[PDB]
Amino acid sequence: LADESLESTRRMLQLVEESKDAGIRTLVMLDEQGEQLERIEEGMDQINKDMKEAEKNLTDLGKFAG
Amino acid sequence: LADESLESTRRMLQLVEESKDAGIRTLVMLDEQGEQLERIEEGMDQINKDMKEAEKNLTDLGK
């Protein structure tokens, strides 16, 4: 009873601490990708708008020339 | 006390099984996102190469 109980408490403690630390670490890292992903969306939409307006204006100018 | 220990054991069982079940699907979702990332990367690389070559050719032709 004593030996098995000591084994159980030791293993439970170590496993629980490992899982807790790993969970907190994943929690902290997720936010970095979140913010970067906001940034990449910003850049993507800016690119889309710029290229769309550029091409439409250029087609209009080409039609004016021709 | 011993019956308190047994009911707490039931609680531990339920919590652990629920956490594992949710873990499985969370891992599946992570796999799906990892799959999509490669395709978006490839499409972005293709567009970058195409626009670079096209604009450089047009600029050279303008001369």
Place this chain on the structure above:
Amino acid sequence: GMDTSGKQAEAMALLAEAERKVKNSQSFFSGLFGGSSKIEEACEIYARAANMFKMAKNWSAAGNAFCQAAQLHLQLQSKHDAATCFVDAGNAFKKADPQEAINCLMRAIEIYTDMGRFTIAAKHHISIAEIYETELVDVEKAIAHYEQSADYYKGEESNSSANKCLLKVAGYAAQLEQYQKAIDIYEQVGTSAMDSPLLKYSAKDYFFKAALCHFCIDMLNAKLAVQKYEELFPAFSDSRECKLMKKLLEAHEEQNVDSYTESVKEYDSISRLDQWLTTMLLRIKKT
């Protein structure tokens, strides 16, 4: 709000001046034949009037304007813009009346398939299937749409999306009591998942559902099927699901309802069950 409704009436007047633009196409464009950009700006005013309609929460009017702009714009040119307008009209029609959303989405599907963009076509296929599930009652049309989308996805080695689509299709078919297809799909997906170290914890449920489907049809061959599964996956017996299935099938050898009822209640005491599983068990165990 109330103020933006007056400007929505002004946007109806914008549609009236767009009617004047098509009147230009009718009569004045003979002298303005070079004004194709005039048609383009007519489409632009159409689009922003439809945007004002959308901001005015007139979903039917917004969809009508979207469809009219798409029809005028798809002059065999700028097909992708027409497809974008059609999908916008379909999204607007999703609320209120979604019937014509199906037709506009099918037209967009045809346009994309002609272009060859399989991913967006399959996503729209899933969208139409799910709107069928949630709004209408037909399942066969949703089944066909899901099969087509799964084919398109598996064409480009997108195995996860196809696998989940096939899982949903197999579940619905099991609800529609077509068990051969269900067991085929479940075995395929489970065995494929067992290939990768990522998804090796998920098979248990797949194999459990496949065993249930098989045991529904032929109880005698269920023992052979479960034995084959166990020898295929040596860690399939240790799971509680295999033990419960073995207990149920061994108890069914004797006509004793109490044993299986207590088994299912005991299993339910650790975790709640789902509607599909409970309904399937209630139907099968009746005899």
Place this chain on the structure above:
Amino acid sequence: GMDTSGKQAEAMALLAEAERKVKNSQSFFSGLFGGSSKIEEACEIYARAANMFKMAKNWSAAGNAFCQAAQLHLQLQSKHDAATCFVDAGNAFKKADPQEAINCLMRAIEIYTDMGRFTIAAKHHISIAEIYETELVDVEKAIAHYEQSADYYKGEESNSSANKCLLKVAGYAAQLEQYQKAIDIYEQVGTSAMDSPLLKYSAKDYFFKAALCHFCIDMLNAKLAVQKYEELFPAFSDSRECKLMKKLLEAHEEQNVDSYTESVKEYDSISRLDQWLTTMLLRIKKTIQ
């Protein structure tokens, strides 16, 4: 700082050149023709000066230069450059003085919704709401901004962000606004989450908050609310929140402060209590009579 000293010196030099360039602009608008390109170069130098001022830590000067460049740019039949410059000025004014940042961000929002990009407009609205609530001591305008953001998000099919926004606004309103809106929003979000497998295991908290809001007004209606919830959601009966609520209402029936206090203390013993929940419990206690 020597680097900062030289940075400020060249910043003043660029400001003087920008003054000369506005002289050029007013001369090319009244004396010469074709000054659109010249004032575009003026805008370029203005943007350079504003960026390097931002580098110099002089946020007010950078924001003022950004705003001047933006308002000058508006006149060139250009709107997206105006929107970007307005957003830059608002970001610069976020710190130090944010009052004019609200006005500039509202102008940018108006222009954006004029074009039709709603998602970015919703994000800017949520930024305005967060800055107002964190820095400005007033909540009603925050409530309005959150309502607008939720409307925009739910109108674009972005369900999750709208759900979080609605939950936040309802929870905040429950503090200083009638609980009817809180009850309605909590019930709506719980119903939406139940079918979905995402928050189905967390909807118990939302039901608990709705039940607390019901209790803070009256008891009989609270009993009807809890029985309806447990009828519609059978699994809530085993929830420890259900037993806690039943014990609390049973104690309240007899008007015993002692039992209620000991029960809430026991509940606090495990896990931990929250500021809002503690305030709600105190408020309902204070009317025991």
Place this chain on the structure above:
Amino acid sequence: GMDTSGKQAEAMALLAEAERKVKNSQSFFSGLFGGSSKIEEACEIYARAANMFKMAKNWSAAGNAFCQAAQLHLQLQSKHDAATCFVDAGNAFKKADPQEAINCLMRAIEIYTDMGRFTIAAKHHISIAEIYETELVDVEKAIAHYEQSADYYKGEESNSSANKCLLKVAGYAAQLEQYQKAIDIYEQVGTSAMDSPLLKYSAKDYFFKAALCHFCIDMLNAKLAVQKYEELFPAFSDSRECKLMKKLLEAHEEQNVDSYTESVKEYDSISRLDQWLTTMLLRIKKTIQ
């Protein structure tokens, strides 16, 4: 199905039309000298026909058409589009003929690395190795491809991908090839993860693997490596794997098969096997004498 038959008919019609188009283009270049638009439109027709054909559920001829279109396009000094079409043809032939897909993918890899792109080249190398090993029974080519992919990844400090490739290579080598290379790769990868942010407690497994390889070579080397790891990584002292390995060592020392058998049985009972450790343990037991 009507769709399949109609699509096949129109695809064959398009193929004949494209052949006649290219022949009349060769004629017209001398007849009229129209430049290169004729060949470009023939290639457009070829691409359209090939994509429709692959949509028609038939693959081999679609890949052949893709190869022909890519070759004709590359004939006009255009490479990137030809490389993409080569990749598509290889993907299509993946399920039709492995050899042609491998040839096309090799051509794409060489041209891409000539351009300067390496990550895509490494991905193509990994795909080639995966297709080679999954269906064709061969390793050495797979090992070389994985090594090349790891080299390309490490050339651009892609530590994770190169680490995975080298781990797979070392595993395969230990399974079949000699053990020295497996020892070096396993030890290096295990010791290059002492300060991992999340993987602080994962390197232990790697170390264990290395020891087994040493234990496969000789007893003296095995014990020396165990001692060196013990001194190098103090935490390895407290690992259950360390106790298991010491027990196996002391059992094998005195030549008592019963002790080793019961130890391995208990180890399997406590934790489930992996199908790789069991084979090495069987090979070790085969030399108990």
Place this chain on the structure above:
Amino acid sequence: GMDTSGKQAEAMALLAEAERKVKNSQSFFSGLFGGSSKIEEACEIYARAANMFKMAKNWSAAGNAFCQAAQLHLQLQSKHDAATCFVDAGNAFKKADPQEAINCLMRAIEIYTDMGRFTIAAKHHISIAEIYETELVDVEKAIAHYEQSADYYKGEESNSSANKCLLKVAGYAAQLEQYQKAIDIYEQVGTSAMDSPLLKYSAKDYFFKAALCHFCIDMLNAKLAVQKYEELFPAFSDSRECKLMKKLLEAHEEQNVDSYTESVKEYDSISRLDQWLTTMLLRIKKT
């Protein structure tokens, strides 16, 4: 092996062709004024030669070629391609000899900040700090680089990026017997971490760290700081860290060295400590 030898042979061939190209290009510009197309062709030759040098596993010469191309291109009144070449040369020089890599990365950062973009400059700054830390011992330059990158990141509202840099700077400052900066950074980040719905759980850890270093002064100040933190975070006492700090304080007040050592060992056994914590605790024990 053979492929590398052939690549290097043709690379020397192309380098001879490239020196011929530049010489004859300047000659032809002088004698004929052909423009700048030849200079662009020489730049492309340099770029491809550097690429095949990298393929040949000669990073020093590849970086030299990249730097030559970058300087020739910036001489051509164009920056972005020159910046790309400079960063490529820096990446090539990362291994082998990283000294000139620092200078070239400085030039890249200078041009980037001149343009007005911050995030890439911050990335280069952190990379340079990492290079200095891993290969050199002058931690002052690393501190400066980390602080500058952190300042850029906070100015650009990238609080998450700034937090990691601040934590690294605080740790390094505490390492070199300097406690004011460590205390300030740790307490500031802990305070700003109070309201984080996610980070709140870890918000305790930083606080504890501060207390430890704040004890490097003396018994008393430490008590005031820890009790202030406990008031500010009422739940801080729930964790064993406050119990351990109280044990340390009470044992050190009475000079109970054996009990202090045993408590530290017990904490190590239940949860092991890292090099930094062990060194700090041993330093505290010295007095």
Place this chain on the structure above:
Amino acid sequence: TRHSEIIKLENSIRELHDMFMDMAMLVESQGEMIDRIEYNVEHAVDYVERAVSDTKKAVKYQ
């Protein structure tokens, strides 16, 4: 001593549960955003491709 173990077990299990729910929520949000950005990127790719094609044809007309 075992009662302290069971109390700490309950606390840590409860904490891990709540953590996991938060991670699931965040992962879902990230996936939603990835879907929308992939759609937009593909649309931009197609638009620029047809833009370059039409511009090249227009130049050829000259």
